[PDB]
Amino acid sequence: GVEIETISPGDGRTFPKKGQTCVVHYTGMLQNGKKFDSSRDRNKPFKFRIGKQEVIKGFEEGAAQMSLGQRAKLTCTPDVAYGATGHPGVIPPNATLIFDVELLNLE
């Protein structure tokens, strides 16, 4: 499940398609916990394409529901990213993930 909470401004019509590399200023957040990842620190805003299963399932489906300029807020379920396995040292198992996502993309 992907729960979108959009901070309003954008256009609402430029949607990502297949094979389009898009740019996201993501910012990860643990529920009742601190941060774990952000693109604002590296300032390398993560040019990734759509439709190759590169990103996790909670982040891929939310990018298809956003548009250019929009600033949403993800709520990623554990069963799609790390709930059974868990990343070693960073994400424990059964973890609900929160992301500050703005789509200022290309292509």
Swiss-Prot record:
Coiled-coil positions: none
Catalytic activity: [protein]-peptidylproline (omega=180) = [protein]-peptidylproline (omega=0)
Cellular component, GO, one term: sarcoplasmic reticulum membrane
GO biological process per UniProt: 'de novo' protein folding; calcium-mediated signaling; insulin secretion involved in cellular response to glucose stimulus; negative regulation of calcium-mediated signaling; negative regulation of heart rate; negative regulation of insulin secretion involved in cellular response to glucose stimulus; negative regulation of release of sequestered calcium ion into cytosol; neuronal action potential propagation
Key words, A-Z: Cytoplasm, Isomerase, Rotamase, Sarcoplasmic reticulum
Enzyme class, broadest EC rank: isomerase
EC number(s) per entry: 5.2.1.8
A Pfam family of this chain: FKBP_C
Gene3D superfamilies: 3.10.50.40
Stored PROSITE patterns: FKBP_PPIASE
Subcellular location(s) of the protein: Cytoplasm; Sarcoplasmic reticulum
The keyword Glycosyltransferase belongs to this UniProt entry's keyword annotation: no
Activation and inhibition: Inhibited by both FK506 and rapamycin.
Tissue: Detected in heart muscle (at protein level). Isoform 1 and isoform 2 are ubiquitous with highest levels in brain and thymus.
Domain spans labelled PPIase FKBP-type: 19-107
Quaternary structure, from the entry: Identified in a complex composed of RYR2, FKBP1B, PKA catalytic subunit, PRKAR2A, AKAP6, and the protein phosphatases PP2A and PP1. Interacts directly with RYR2.
Family the entry assigns: Belongs to the FKBP-type PPIase family. FKBP1 subfamily.
PANTHER family: PEPTIDYL-PROLYL CIS-TRANS ISOMERASE (PTHR10516), PEPTIDYL-PROLYL CIS-TRANS ISOMERASE FKBP1B (PTHR10516:SF429)
Function of the molecule: Has the potential to contribute to the immunosuppressive and toxic effects of FK506 and rapamycin. PPIases accelerate the folding of proteins. It catalyzes the cis-trans isomerization of proline imidic peptide bonds in oligopeptides.
Protein name (record): Peptidyl-prolyl cis-trans isomerase FKBP1B
Originating organism: Homo sapiens (Human)
